Design a protein around this ligand. Structure first.
Ligand SMILES: Nc1ncnc2c1ncn2[C@@H]1O[C@H](COP(=O)(O)OP(=O)(O)OP(=O)(O)O)[C@@H](O)[C@H]1O
Ligand SMILES: [Mg+2]
Length: 275
């Protein structure tokens, strides 16, 4: 990662906490193309140095994925370690998290918009699959909306997938349980079961969120009931927009070896019309 001077970062707004992170909107002063001085809007993800294992996992993850440039993967500009903390400097995505976006717009988007976003996410995941890179933190909050749909020009919404964060192989078991049903059953059983199949399961859960207006699946269940949900091998209810219900269930297969490849997922979508 490109090292960014601490004096070149300004923190403007707090955006709350993530998973052992503090997140801010800020500005980076930089020399850009043609030597132009810019003040670029940035997302700053702050990790405490004292949480050494978490920080190492987080930055290893961000670093590996950032070696893989793709139009649907978020851009990281660099890192700043020369402070009291370790900071990831990321592009600021104008329309924020997809789940929030769907809530704020009262789910007034049509099925074709949802399908377009699903196809974009699937394209990102196929690229990661071909690169044998496990993300491990796919969910609608981690889908960032770059651009809204434009009816006049016919341009679809455009998304990027966030950095992976701290690996579920290092996070505390209680956090994994809270993350049912994004974390698949085999990882609740042993986090070492993390695999490319993991992201197929989480993709299914993410599609459920997209089709449910940014609702969270199993929100009414505490962690003990979420464990019972997997014990009894339940599936999620068909979402409000039921068009993707079959694909959701096929991806959320309790047998990880039976989850379809992302190429197969993409074909199914097209046919509708660190660790
Ligand atoms: N690149 C970005 N641009 C704009 N907003 C962002 C960006 N990344 C995150 N956010 C916003 O920051 C807030 C915190 O994000 P989030 O909970 O995903 O943090 P995190 O550190 O990535 O945690 P996790 O690993 O659980 O995803 C949310 O409001 C989210 O929309
Ligand atoms: Mg995130």
């Amino acid at each position: 990662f490109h090292k960014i001077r601490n004096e070149d970062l300004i923190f403007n707004e707090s955006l709350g906490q993530g998973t052992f992170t503090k997140i801010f909107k800020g500005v980076r002063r930089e020399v850009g193309d043609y030597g132009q001085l810019h003040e670029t809007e940035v997302l700053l993800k702050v990790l405490d140095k004292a949480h050494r294992n978490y920080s190492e996992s987080f930055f290893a993850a961000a670093s590996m994925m950032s070696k893989l440039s793709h139009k649907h993967l978020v851009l990281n500009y660099g890192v700043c370690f020369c402070g009291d903390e370790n900071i990831l400097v990321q592009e600021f995505v104008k329309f924020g998290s997809l789940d929030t976006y769907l809530k704020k717009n009262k789910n007034c988007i049509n099925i074709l918009w949802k399908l377009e976003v699903a196809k974009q996410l699937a394209a990102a995941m196929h690229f990661l699959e071909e690169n044998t890179l496990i993300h491990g933190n796919v969910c609608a909050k981690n889908i960032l909306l770059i651009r809204e749909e434009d009816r006049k020009t016919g341009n679809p919404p455009f998304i990027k997938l966030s950095d992976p964060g701290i690996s579920i192989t290092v996070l505390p078991k209680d956090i994994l349980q809270e993350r049912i049903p994004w974390v698949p059953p085999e990882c609740i059983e042993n986090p070492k079961n993390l695999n490319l199949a993991t992201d197929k399961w989480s993709f299914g859960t993410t599609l459920w969120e997209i089709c449910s207006g940014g609702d969270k699946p199993l929100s009414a269940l505490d962690s003990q009931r979420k464990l019972q949900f997997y014990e009894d091998r339940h599936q999620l209810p068909a979402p409000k927009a039921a068009e993707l219900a079959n694909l959701i269930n096929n991806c959320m297969d309790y047998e990880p070896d039976h989850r379809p490849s992302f190429r197969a997922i993409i074909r199914d979508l097209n046919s509708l019309f660190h660790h």
